[PDB]
Amino acid sequence: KLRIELGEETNDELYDLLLLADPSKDIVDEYLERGECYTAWAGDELAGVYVLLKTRPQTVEIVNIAVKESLQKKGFGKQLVLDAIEKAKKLGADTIEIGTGNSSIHQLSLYQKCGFRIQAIDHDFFLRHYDEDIFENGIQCRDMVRLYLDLL
Amino acid sequence: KLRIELGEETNDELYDLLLLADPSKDIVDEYLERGECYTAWAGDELAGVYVLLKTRPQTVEIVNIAVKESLQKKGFGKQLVLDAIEKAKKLGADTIEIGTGNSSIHQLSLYQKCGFRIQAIDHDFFLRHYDEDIFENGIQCRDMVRLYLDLL
Amino acid sequence: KLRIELGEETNDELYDLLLLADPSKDIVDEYLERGECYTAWAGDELAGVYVLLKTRPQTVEIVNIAVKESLQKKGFGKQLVLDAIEKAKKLGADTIEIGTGNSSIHQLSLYQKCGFRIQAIDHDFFLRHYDEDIFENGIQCRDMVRLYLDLL
Amino acid sequence: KLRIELGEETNDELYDLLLLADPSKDIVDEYLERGECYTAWAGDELAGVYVLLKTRPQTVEIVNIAVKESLQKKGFGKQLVLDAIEKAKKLGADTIEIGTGNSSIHQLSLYQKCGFRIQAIDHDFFLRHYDEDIFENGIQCRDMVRLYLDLL
Ligand SMILES: CC(C)(COP(=O)(O)OP(=O)(O)OC[C@H]1O[C@@H](n2cnc3c(N)ncnc32)[C@H](O)[C@@H]1OP(=O)(O)O)[C@@H](O)C(=O)NCCC(=O)NCCS
Numbered sequence: 001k002l003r004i005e006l007g008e009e010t011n012d013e014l015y016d017l018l019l020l021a022d023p024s025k026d027i028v029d030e031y032l033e034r035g036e037c038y039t040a041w042a043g044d045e046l047a048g049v050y051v052l053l054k055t056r057p058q059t060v061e062i063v064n065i066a067v068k069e070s071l072q073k074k075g076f077g078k079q080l081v082l083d084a085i086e087k088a089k090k091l092g093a094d095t096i097e098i099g100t101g102n103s104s105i106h107q108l109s110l111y112q113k114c115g116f117r118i119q120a121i122d123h124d125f126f127l128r129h130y131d132e133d134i135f136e137n138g139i140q141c142r143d144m145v146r147l148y149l150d151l152l
Numbered sequence: 153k154l155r156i157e158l159g160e161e162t163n164d165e166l167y168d169l170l171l172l173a174d175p176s177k178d179i180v181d182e183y184l185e186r187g188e189c190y191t192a193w194a195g196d197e198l199a200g201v202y203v204l205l206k207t208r209p210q211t212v213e214i215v216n217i218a219v220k221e222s223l224q225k226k227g228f229g230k231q232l233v234l235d236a237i238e239k240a241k242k243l244g245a246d247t248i249e250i251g252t253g254n255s256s257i258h259q260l261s262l263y264q265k266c267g268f269r270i271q272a273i274d275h276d277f278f279l280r281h282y283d284e285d286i287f288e289n290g291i292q293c294r295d296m297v298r299l300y301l302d303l304l
Numbered sequence: 305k306l307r308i309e310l311g312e313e314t315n316d317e318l319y320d321l322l323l324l325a326d327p328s329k330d331i332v333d334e335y336l337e338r339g340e341c342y343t344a345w346a347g348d349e350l351a352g353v354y355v356l357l358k359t360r361p362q363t364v365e366i367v368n369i370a371v372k373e374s375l376q377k378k379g380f381g382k383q384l385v386l387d388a389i390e391k392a393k394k395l396g397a398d399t400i401e402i403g404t405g406n407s408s409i410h411q412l413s414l415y416q417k418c419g420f421r422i423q424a425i426d427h428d429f430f431l432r433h434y435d436e437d438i439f440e441n442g443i444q445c446r447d448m449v450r451l452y453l454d455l456l
Numbered sequence: 457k458l459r460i461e462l463g464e465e466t467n468d469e470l471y472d473l474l475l476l477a478d479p480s481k482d483i484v485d486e487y488l489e490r491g492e493c494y495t496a497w498a499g500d501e502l503a504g505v506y507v508l509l510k511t512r513p514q515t516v517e518i519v520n521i522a523v524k525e526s527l528q529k530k531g532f533g534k535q536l537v538l539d540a541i542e543k544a545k546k547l548g549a550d551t552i553e554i555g556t557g558n559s560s561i562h563q564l565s566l567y568q569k570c571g572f573r574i575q576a577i578d579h580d581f582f583l584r585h586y587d588e589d590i591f592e593n594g595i596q597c598r599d600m601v602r603l604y605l606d607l608l
Pocket residue numbers: 020021022062063064065066067068071072073074075076077078079100107110113290
């Protein structure tokens with residue numbers, strides 16, 4: 001359904017989504033440039049977005065993925081993930097990664113449903129990389145769950 | 153609410169619950185003996201059950217926990233977990249553990265809500281310890297998520 | 305070479321070894337009882353010792369292993385490890401574990417040489433379970449390296 | 457002691473070092489370009505070399521480091537690592553990574569001595585990414601030990 005295409009021009013409407021995932025606009029711009037940003041449109045409305053950054057050799061990661069609140073929960077999330085996997089294949093990558101907070105129960109499900117498997121956990125991650133205490137779904141988000149998926 | 157008390161007598165009604173979690177009745181009997189089995193009643197009806205087995209030094213694990221299907225989703229799950237943590241405290245244990253399949257999204261939430269933090273993952277676990285392919289919530293259950301919780 | 309046999313009687317000479325690995329005599333006694341303690345003699349002299357404790361279901365761990373300083377570095381270490389693996393086999397265990405501090409470079413080698421593979425890391429472990437700062441080989445020992453080895 | 461400076465010209469003498477670490481010349485060229493390659497000279501002789509590749513956002517990794525065999529073991533190894541950490545700081549990175557095979561006991565020590573801490577293990581890594589069986593120090597190298605180090 002969703003029509004996804006490459007992106008090169010960032011505007012307030014787009015930053016709104018990218019900022020839903022990564023609050024720090026600074027860090028966003030870093031990988032937004034060094035990485036590939038794709039935008040998904042549903043007609044004329046900006047549905048969602050996701051960035052593919054290249055990390056370790058032969059390894060690529062989804063450094064950011066988001067869907068407009070008024071349009072999420074409709075299945076666009078899964079479409080983007082499954083799509084990022086395809087862009088990653090044509091990129092010749094061997095393994096694709098992505099990670100979120102231990103509190104993000106929903107995502108922990110979604111990603112796995114798209115083939116991702118949990119690799120390891122970066123303990124105290126959010127504790128040392130953030131000033132305040134992040135909370136979500138009655139859980140203290142303080143660990144970075146790392147997931148991966150081999151393409152072969 | 154739920155009234156939990158020690159258990160020493162196993163009967164079909166009880167095995168029904170223990171088998172909800174661990175299918176293998178053999179393995180169950182092993183830790184059922186070497187471990188402490190508690191039963192929770194809601195009046196005269198057998199609500200749920202859970203076993204506390206001692207693993208590493210100063211470490212105890214919830215090798216099994218279940219709640220009657222016709223009574224689960226009412227909050228008894230959380231009560232048992234929170235209760236097992238108390239039995240574990242009086243047992244002088246330093247850390248308490250518990251782990252489930254990566255597909256068990258619901259549990260991954262519950263346990264964390266009771267303080268548990270994800271430790272590490274036992275990759276391909278269910279692949280080598282089971283013959284068939286376990287599936288749940290549209291996810292291929294094949295990894296053993298290990299969680300823990302220090303008591304101090 | 306080393307002659308290893310079951311043990312049931314603890315004496316100062318034996319505690320000296322067990323305490324080389326685990327300083328806390330209290331914790332030692334715990335698993336010393338609940339676990340199986342084997343002693344290795346080289347003639348009439350107490351060469352070394354090791355304890356096999358049963359942790360998770362079908363899983364056994366070497367909660368302690370040591371060799372008299374005046375006799376270590378002669379290869380008795382490896383013999384005990386390889387021996388504990390055999391006792392573990394006859395015990396019908398599926399997997400055997402053992403872990404040490406990230407600073408224990410020597411052991412990280414030894415164990416792997418006996419088939420052990422690194423599983424996961426318990427970050428900050430020694431930080432929360434000990435009062436002082438442990439140091440060894442110019443490394444700040446603060447992480448618990450968990451290793452395992454399937455028996456099949 | 458060692459004089460380290462940026463590099464842009466690759467010659468047989470340099471590839472000799474880079475290939476000591478990563479045999480695959482192909483993969484080397486990939487990160488050799490997308491990454492920053494520094495060379496360390498001890499007078500007029502090419503002492504060693506190391507490459508800083510940028511992986512995850514705010515994260516940089518030492519994708520390759522080596523020292524001329526006839527000059528290693530003199531402490532140049534440590535100098536390069538400690539130097540890569542400084543180049544990484546001025547690069548504004550938050551965390552720096554580096555990983556080697558579980559068999560590389562020597563490095564497991566070196567890196568830790570430079571502040572690196574073991575993060576997680578990529579099981580069966582070398583089994584699926586290499587055709588032959590790698591061996592070293594009487595150990596079957598088949599796991600990728602991942603280390604990291606926060607810069608703040
Ligand atoms: C993460 C995100 C992109 C994906 O969004 P999404 O639209 O919410 O998720 P989807 O609707 O596409 O998920 C589909 C799965 O979840 C399940 N699901 C749908 N509604 C559900 C509900 N109410 N409760 C539990 N599961 C549900 C479905 O089973 C579906 O799987 P299926 O296709 O196999 O049937 C969106 O939540 C978001 O952008 N959030 C804010 C930013 C963020 O967290 N970014 C990522 C960090 S880098």
